[PDB]
Swiss-Prot record, chain A:
It is a peripheral membrane protein. Component of the TIM22 complex, whose core is composed of TIM18, TIM22 and TIM54, associated with the peripheral proteins MRS5/TIM12 and the 70 kDa heterohexamer composed of TIM9 and TIM10 (or TIM8 and TIM13). Interacts directly with both the TIM22 protein and the TIM9-TIM10 heterohexamer. Interacts with multi-pass transmembrane proteins in transit. Disulfide bonds join C26-C52, C30-C48. The keyword Zinc applies. GO terms for molecular function: metal ion binding; phospholipid binding. The lineage of its organism: Eukaryota, Fungi, Dikarya, Ascomycota, Saccharomycotina. GO terms for cellular component: mitochondrial inner membrane; mitochondrial intermembrane space protein transporter complex; mitochondrion; TIM22 mitochondrial import inner membrane insertion complex. Transmembrane segments: none annotated. It is found in: Mitochondrion inner membrane; Mitochondrion intermembrane space. Its main location: mitochondrion. It comes from the Eukaryota. This is Mitochondrial import inner membrane translocase subunit TIM12. A motif (Twin CX3C motif) lies at residues 26-52.
UniProtKB/Swiss-Prot annotation, chain B:
It comes from the Eukaryota. It comes from Saccharomyces cerevisiae (strain ATCC 204508 / S288c) (Baker's yeast). GO terms for biological process: protein insertion into mitochondrial inner membrane. It is found in: Mitochondrion inner membrane. This is Mitochondrial import inner membrane translocase subunit TIM22. InterPro entries: TIM22. Pfam families: Tim17 (PF02466). Essential core component of the TIM22 complex, a complex that mediates the import and insertion of multi-pass transmembrane proteins, such as mitochondrial carrier family members, into the mitochondrial inner membrane. In the TIM22 complex, it constitutes the voltage-activated and signal-gated channel. Forms a twin-pore translocase that uses the membrane potential as external driving force in 2 voltage-dependent steps. Mediates the insertion of precursor proteins in a 3 step process. GO terms for cellular component: cytosol; mitochondrial inner membrane; mitochondrial intermembrane space; mitochondrion; TIM22 mitochondrial import inner membrane insertion complex. The keyword Transmembrane applies.
Curated annotation (Swiss-Prot), chains D, E:
The gene is TIM9. GO terms for cellular component: mitochondrial inner membrane; mitochondrial intermembrane space; mitochondrial intermembrane space protein transporter complex; mitochondrion; TIM22 mitochondrial import inner membrane insertion complex. Gene3D superfamilies: Mitochondrial import inner membrane translocase subunit tim13 like domains (1.10.287.810). It holds the Pfam family zf-Tim10_DDP. This is Mitochondrial import inner membrane translocase subunit TIM9. The lineage of its organism: Eukaryota, Fungi, Dikarya, Ascomycota, Saccharomycotina.
Swiss-Prot record, chain F:
The keyword Amino-acid biosynthesis does not apply. Present with 4440 molecules/cell in log phase SD medium. It comes from Saccharomyces cerevisiae (strain ATCC 204508 / S288c). Component of the TIM22 complex, a complex that mediates the import and insertion of multi-pass transmembrane proteins into the mitochondrial inner membrane. The TIM22 complex forms a twin-pore translocase that uses the membrane potential as external driving force. Its role in the complex is unclear but it may be involved in the assembly and stabilization of the TIM22 complex. The gene is TIM18. Component of the TIM22 complex, whose core is composed of TIM18, TIM22 and TIM54, associated with the peripheral proteins MRS5/TIM12 and the 70 kDa heterohexamer composed of TIM9 and TIM10 (or TIM8 and TIM13). This is Mitochondrial import inner membrane translocase subunit TIM18. The lineage of its organism: Eukaryota, Fungi, Dikarya, Ascomycota, Saccharomycotina. Residues 49-52 are mitochondrial intermembrane.
Amino acid sequence: SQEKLDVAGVQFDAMCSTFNNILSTCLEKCIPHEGFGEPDLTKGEQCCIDRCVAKMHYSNRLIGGFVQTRGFGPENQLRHYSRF
Amino acid sequence: PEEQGERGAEMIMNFMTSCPGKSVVSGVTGFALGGVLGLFMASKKSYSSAKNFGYIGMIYAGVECVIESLRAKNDIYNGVTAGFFTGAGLAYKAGPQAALMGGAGFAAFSAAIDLYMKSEDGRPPQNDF
Amino acid sequence: KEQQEFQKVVEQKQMKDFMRLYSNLVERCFTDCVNDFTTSKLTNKEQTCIMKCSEKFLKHSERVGQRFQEQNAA
Amino acid sequence: DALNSKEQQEFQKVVEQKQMKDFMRLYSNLVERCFTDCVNDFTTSKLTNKEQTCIMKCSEKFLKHSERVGQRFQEQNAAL
Amino acid sequence: DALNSKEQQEFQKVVEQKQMKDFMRLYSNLVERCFTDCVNDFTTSKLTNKEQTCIMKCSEKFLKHSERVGQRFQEQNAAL
Amino acid sequence: VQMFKPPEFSQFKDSYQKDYERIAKYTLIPLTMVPFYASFTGGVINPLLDASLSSIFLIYLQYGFTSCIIDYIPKEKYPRWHKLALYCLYGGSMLSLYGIYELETKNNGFVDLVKKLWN
Amino acid sequence: QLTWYLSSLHRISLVLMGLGFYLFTILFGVSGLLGLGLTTEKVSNWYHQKFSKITEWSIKGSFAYLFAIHYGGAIRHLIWDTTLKGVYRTGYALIGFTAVLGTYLLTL
Amino acid sequence: RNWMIFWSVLTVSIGGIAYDKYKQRQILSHATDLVKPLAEESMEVDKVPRKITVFIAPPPNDYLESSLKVWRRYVKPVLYYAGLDYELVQEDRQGIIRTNVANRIRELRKEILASGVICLGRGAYKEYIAGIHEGLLGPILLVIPIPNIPRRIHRFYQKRFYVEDVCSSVVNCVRQ
Amino acid sequence: SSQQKIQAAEAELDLVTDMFNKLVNNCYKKCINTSYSEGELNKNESSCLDRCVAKYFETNVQVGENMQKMGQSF
Amino acid sequence: SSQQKIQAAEAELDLVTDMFNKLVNNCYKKCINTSYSEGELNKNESSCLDRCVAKYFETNVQVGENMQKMGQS
């Protein structure tokens, strides 16, 4: 079944985009931009990455719930696609 | 058959890393280093020196690893409180002002040590002049 | 005549751009007001801040889409 | 997704293809981040020793950060 | 990479298509850059002549910058 | 005819428990106003202040419990339960430090717990 | 006498607030060495479900009245900074400040 | 009087050290004087700037890092400002500068028959002029700054004239 | 041919899509206050957004004229 | 086949293209100033860009070796 296959493919893409967003944001937030003391990241960065991915996954769940309440979709937001 | 083995490997990683291990490995390290320095101290004395240096190492690494599991950071203002509470908890048995001065001196010593070990990985500058 | 596969790739580009817009929304609304990572669970203040940010970005995107439509039609 | 059968074998190959694409994108972002952080000495035209230690530390810290966020994302999606 | 000698021409066609698509992407990125860099005032609906000149300086500086970096890119990728 | 003293507690003889208890009291007095001031205006409070407040509260409560336990269970008389209850005070202090640390990170703070119990 | 009254009130407020603080801290202490997972939300939900209104109000009134006794500990610090007209004035100011602070904390 | 004369000799030693390093920082004003001709328009694709090859030899029987110190701290801002794309040819043994320049001239001669310079040190200039006389005659602008037990302290205190000499020679090389 | 017309039809929407995305991102950077106090835009923000999209289209046409000026037509 | 070879070449092409885009953006951020004073390419920046593309290629080579040290690609 091709249709269920690429339905699972776009679902995995929706997982992958969220995962890359979590990874880039928790990279930016509390890995220090100045300097690195060592490889094999320390205790503080481990704890901050755990708390960042917890806060970030809960925030992604909350916003993905809220934009369905406010009706945000491709038809309601992407007005510029109606020209084509 | 392997579930308890992999859980034991994960538990020994957690016990060697996530601050219980941090507290006791530096404690026995300070104990062995105090037993080494007791050869120069006696030249019960070596036992008291080993107890003192094991206390110093254990409470410094424990307060550091519990401040750093807090605060979500990996910067300075860590050692200037870890050594402060180390000096307080060590020279606590005699005098409040003496505990304050001992904590302040140990905080300045830990800050100097962290500024020596830290001002080499700070940032590659715009010029090596 | 060739517009069916063209509208298929328009729909695919639409889905990709919608996912990118949603990810940029979540990225901005996170990165703006979660700046203290001592706790591991969101406070009431940061949760209200995130809901305010998502509402503001949604109506801001609608406003920008309206003005973009009226300056693209002209 | 949920319905897995004999057809999931090609799905895992497509997942491997997408994982190769995502690792190439992650490698490019890794090079960009490690160049942005501490390769900021522009007198010479070759990497000095401090920038080499920077690039090693930034690369290993970035890979440990990526695998940490991957396993914690799995542990957070498992709970829900 | 390495393929048939007759297929180099269609390869050059898709190289040209990639070049014009990247050219339009560079155009949009330049518009974003000196919209970001030089237009901080938001009291009018028209551009100040000072911010006009800047959009002049950004356009020339980023395009000469892009051509210099493209030449050095061809020079550096000639070796490797 | 006299302005004798603040009412003294059973301070330990060799230790400087009176002075450290005074220090914990005098720094705990203005520190408790900070959640009251920051809670009156809005819902804003930050950790490392709830943690320090609960830790100073713990040190002060441990001093109060040692003073009441020396006052009521003597050292010279009935000393068998006394060392065991001192050890249970220290075990409760350690388990409560771990509870404070689990309340600051995995939860939203002890002052937030107090407010969610009052609400 | 007033000194026995204030010292006994200080002692009983200290020990009851000590049991409350120690219990609420080591509830989260024993959840971390084990795998219990007790949040503030779960404990607050259980406390608001299993307890009725009037017992909650009595607990809140007791705790808010006894916290003003430790601000009376700040008052006995104020006498510790340096007579019967002094100590009776501090006792009357103690009980009045305790009453108005318990009212203000019950209004919260 | 003991602690008085102790802190007196300590503060005059530290005052001399701070005065020498402050004057070394003061010569960076004339480095900024060389930053003034930097702001000139280079072209896009054609113009690659004027290359100043620099030959580095260590002082005799000790390490390369002394000549690298006198290279970096004093000469390299001057060549980094005014946009002069330098190149560094350093040696650890003897003769590598000589065989480098001689192999360069020999490769130019072999290629044609197939059909400024700032060297630091008396040894580097010796090997460079030997490489020139070997490449031009044999078979198939110059600027010479000079790098250098209580004499070490006397040089370490009389340092401002040395960095004035090196910076004045290299600004004469860059400006002219 | 078919690939030529589908490439032109792809580019004519890729340009407007990337312009909309960069418009939303840059106008959210420039105008919107990061300190969220309410979920709706103020009367100042609603005007500065219109000035933002207007100034963005002016920058687009000026950069187009400047790239036609010194850049060759090829 | 021809389509497979063309896609295998196109992957290399747009890989090199996005490398070039990130290169342009980073070396613009590094020492090319944001305060546009004169409409020129300065003599400092014209060597900045040479050293910047050289250092970026050495950075990409070094990270490509550090990936291949470990068991990955």
